[PDB]
């Protein structure tokens, strides 16, 4: 039915009028029952993670008591379904197995990774008191869960020697974006509090700010990376790798980013574009620009960063720095808006742009052109407000069809929920 995306290539319009630019469609269909939902009032579906493999997809969501950024975690649900076609205009889902992780009060975060008829879930846990009370924001180990169609899941426990992370960490959070599976290994992205014992020269790149350099005197850029203004603790990102995933004894290794080329740690994702790889890092401080890196392999040294702005995060932000010259300051954004590449150098890609309105939000869907142009279409004019987005394209009926998973509120007075949609990417040349 569906196949891993094969990128459009210019097979025409290569004479003189050669603007081979793709654009989104004109319809924004729905994908009902992507994951089980409810209608209770004291619930918030808050943290989604979506991934599509060769034919199957993995989906995970988080349910909180009353608050969306906080509150006791009622449960975490994972759905293993297959993308199929039932004669309707667009693609459709068909869950095969719904699963709830045991003891959801010990989890810090979770993410999924869909391969070839095989699903993976990796969750970081926190230290448990003598009574078993979860000591929040501590780190103890990992759980790796194996998923196969028509097959009971298998759980792997990773603790002690099984994980050797570069620096000593105290709290670890797995990026909600997820990961990939190549060969007999896995690749996620994690962030946490890392105790630094050297000099910090944090990355400080900003526009023409003339206040005091816009706080560009690097004291504030260093201040942002520090935990509570202490040099001894930092918030940093790091690659994560699992060895011998087939063997029943996996092992974990990490690779921490230098602060000299990074911003405060946040959620991110791992891509598998072409034969290369990719990584997206969500804004978490004054800098609200796009942060994407294309790497020949999975190594901090070999990572190369993109030089594009959109999508400029503009929601769930506390900053006040013009987006013409992002002037370093101090704030805490809590949004998420990833970009799915549509080329080998990722000069094509597609994203979801959210802009806040007097009330709620106004959103649009766009596909970035390598020439710098964009093609934008307004979407969801009924919903009160949406906050995050996640895209995962694929080949389906000799065409590129993408599924956008979002969360928000259709009615102002309803709790936060998760909504799924799909659209089409069509290639054409002027």
């Amino acid at each position, epitope marked *: 039915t569906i196949k891993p995306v094969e990128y459009y290539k210019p097979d025409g319009c290569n004479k003189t009028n050669d603007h081979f630019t793709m654009q989104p469609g004109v319809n*924004f*269909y729905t994908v009902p029952n992507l994951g089980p939902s409810s*209608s*209770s*009032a004291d619930e918030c579906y808050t943290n989604p993670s979506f991934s599509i493999g060769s034919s199957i997809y993995m989906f995970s969501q988080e349910i909180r008591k009353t608050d969306c950024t906080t509150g006791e975690i009622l449960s975490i649900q994972i759905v293993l379904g297959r993308i199929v076609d039932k004669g309707q205009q667009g693609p459709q889902a068909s869950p095969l197995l719904v699963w709830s992780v045991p003891n959801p009060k010990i989890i810090n975060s979770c993410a999924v990774a869909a391969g070839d008829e095989t699903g993976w879930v990796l969750c970081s846990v926190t230290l448990t008191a003598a009574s078993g009370e979860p000591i929040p924001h501590m780190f103890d180990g990992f759980w790796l869960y194996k998923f196969e169609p028509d097959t009971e899941v298998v759980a792997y426990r990773i603790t002690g020697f099984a994980y050797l992370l570069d620096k000593v960490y105290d709290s670890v959070f797995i990026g909600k974006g997820g990961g990939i599976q190549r060969g007999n290994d896995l690749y996620f992205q994690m962030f946490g509090l890392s105790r630094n014992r050297q000099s910090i020269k944090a990355l400080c790149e900003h526009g023409s700010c003339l206040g005091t350099g816009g706080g560009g005197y690097q004291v504030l850029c260093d201040r942002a990376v520090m935990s509570f203004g202490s040099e001894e603790s930092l918030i940093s990102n790091a690659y994560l790798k699992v060895n011998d995933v087939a063997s029943g004894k996996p092992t974990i290794i990490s690779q921490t980013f230098p602060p000299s080329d990074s911003y405060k740690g946040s959620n991110g994702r791992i891509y598998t574009i072409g034969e290369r790889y990719g990584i997206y890092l969500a804004p978490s401080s004054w800098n609200r620009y796009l942060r994407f890196g294309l790497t020949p392999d999975i190594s901090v040294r070999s990572t190369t960063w993109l030089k594009e702005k959109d999508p400029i995060m503009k929601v769930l932000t506390t900053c006040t720095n013009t987006d013409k010259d992002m002037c370093p300051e101090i704030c805490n954004t809590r949004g998420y808006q990833d970009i799915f590449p549509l080329s080998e150098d990722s000069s094509f890609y597609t994203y979801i742009g959210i802009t806040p309105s007097n009330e709620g939000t106004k959103s649009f869907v766009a596909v970035k052109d390598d020439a710098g142009h964009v093609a934008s279409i307004t979407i969801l004019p*009924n919903y009160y407000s949406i906050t995050s987005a996640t895209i995962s394209c694929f080949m389906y009926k000799e065409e590129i069809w993408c599924i956008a998973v979002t969360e928000g509120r*259709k009615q102002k007075e309803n709790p936060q929920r998760i909504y799924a949609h799909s659209y089409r990417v069509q290639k054409m040349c002027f």
Partner: antibody, heavy 120, light 108 residues
Framework: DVQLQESGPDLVKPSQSLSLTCTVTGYSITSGYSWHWIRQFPGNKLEWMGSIHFSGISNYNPSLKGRISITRDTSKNQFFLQLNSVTTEDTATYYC?????????????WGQGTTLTVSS | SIVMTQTPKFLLVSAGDRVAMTCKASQSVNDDVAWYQQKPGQSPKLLINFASNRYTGVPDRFTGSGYGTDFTFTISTVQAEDLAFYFCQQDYSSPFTFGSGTKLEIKR
């Protein structure tokens, strides 16, 4: 299971006021879901009247011209309808209906309905 | 408000035949539409939602399609107990409206 059951007067003189009462058993009105009133004239045409969100807010059809009022009594787990200055045009069958805002987005459970006649 | 025009009002067909009814709106409502069936002396029951999905437990004879403004509801083969009242309801925005409905009777 959730079970809606209407009750009230069925013969009303012109220009009087109408007071319906929908009783819900097996599910608290405050927990979730919306709750609406929908009338079906002879000829089977249908029309929405209004609702009352589970928090307490109430919404009304603009065409009713503000002659309608929806209230709730949480102690008895009920919600009522008030219509003023009724006439022979307001002869129909009235339902109290639950609505889901989660996965379905549809009117799930409906009451048996009550017949209302306006005459002198 | 959003106006829903539903045609045709009366359909008389023989057992096994297929039928099609059209429900049209006055402005774009994307795919927020549903189709209900009301048996005589019975509350309505959802039959199609999102203008194409088949609700759980609904047999395969019923099918829906359409996006934007023009919508269609079709039955592959009419059975004996399929005579009922069918109407289209939109959920784009409040106030919710219903189509005028359609009446189905069986030839014999």
């Amino acid at each position: 299971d959730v079970q809606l059951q209407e009750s009230g007067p069925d013969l009303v003189k012109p220009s009087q006021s109408l007071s319906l009462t929908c009783t819900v058993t097996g599910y608290s009105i405050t927990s979730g879901y919306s709750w609406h009133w929908i009338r079906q004239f002879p000829g089977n045409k249908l029309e929405w009247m209004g609702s009352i969100h589970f928090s307490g807010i109430s919404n009304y059809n603009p065409s009713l011209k503000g002659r309608i009022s929806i209230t709730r009594d949480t102690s008895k787990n009920q919600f009522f309808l008030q219509l003023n200055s009724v006439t022979t045009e307001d002869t129909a069958t009235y339902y109290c209906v639950r609505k889901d805002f989660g996965s379905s987005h549809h009117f799930d459970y409906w009451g048996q309905g009550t017949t209302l006649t306006v005459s002198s | 408000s959003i106006v829903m025009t539903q045609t045709p009002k009366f359909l008389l067909v023989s057992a096994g035949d297929r039928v099609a009814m059209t429900c049209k709106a006055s402005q774009s409502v994307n795919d927020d539409v549903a189709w209900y069936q009301q048996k005589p002396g019975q509350s309505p029951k959802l039959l199609i939602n999102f203008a194409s999905n088949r609700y759980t437990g609904v047999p395969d004879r019923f099918t829906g399609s359409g996006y934007g403004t023009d919508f269609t509801f079709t039955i592959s083969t009419v059975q004996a107990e399929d005579l009922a009242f069918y109407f289209c309801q939109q959920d784009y925005s409040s106030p919710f409206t219903f189509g005028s409905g359609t009446k189905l009777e069986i030839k014999r």
